[PDB]
């Protein structure tokens, strides 16, 4: 397949957290308008991650999914506190193509299988946040607050066994940096799974995306570098095509 470029949007109370610099938009903090714009200039898939306070979270997330599905024609994923099958199910039925889970999947891996039984493996994305600890890649939950003691190597294999469709590999060792994706981690994981691997954390310039695809990533996901216009999505795709990467061009 072609290599995918994904844009992630953090959301709270129906707004893009910290907005975006796209002066041309009516509302640069409007997740729907911004995702529609990204879909027009060349992003392949969108991810939305909600951090709304529990009282309004369920209906805020369902309303977002509904508005996005009407307005955009590329696949999109929703996540943020999805803890059970009925919550994932209503978000998929309401419009999302995929649901993203992490901590809830670590604590109950059968939740992967439960969702895949009704919506297909392709509807399940498992985010794996990993960090070096004493020379081993370990899995972390609760926004990186908890070292689970589960080896990355073992969790990847279990996630595919349980029926997940894709893995987002987020390197806590690259959080808040602009040094590049964790290509050592990507090369570690690549021989362990047949599933699509989405690289996350570390992006600072176009060349980093090339490095991630040489490391075996099937997609690369970024956020602030896009929203704050440090990297132009069309220039990135032109750059990657120029140097031999198969990406989808318009």
Author numbering: 2 to 251
Quoted from the paper:
Computational design of KE07 involved construction of a theozyme to catalyze the chemical reaction, which was then grafted into the scaffold of imidazole glycerol phosphate synthase (HisF) from Thermotoga maritima. Catalytically essential residues from the initial design include a base (Glu101) that facilitates C−H bond cleavage, an H-bond donor (Lys222) to stabilize the phenoxide intermediate, and a π-stacking residue (Trp50), which was designed to stabilize the transition state and favor substrate binding through interactions with the aromatic ring of the substrate. This initial KE07 design (Round 1; R1) catalyzes the cleavage of 5-nitrobenzisoxazole, with 103-fold rate acceleration over the noncatalyzed reaction and a turnover rate (kcat) of 0.018 s−1.
Thus, the mechanism by which the remote mutations that appear in R5 and R6 increase activity is qualitatively different. This is mirrored in their location within the protein; in contrast to the initial mutations that affect the active site directly, the mutations in R5 (Val12Met) and R6 (Lys146Thr) are remote from the active site.
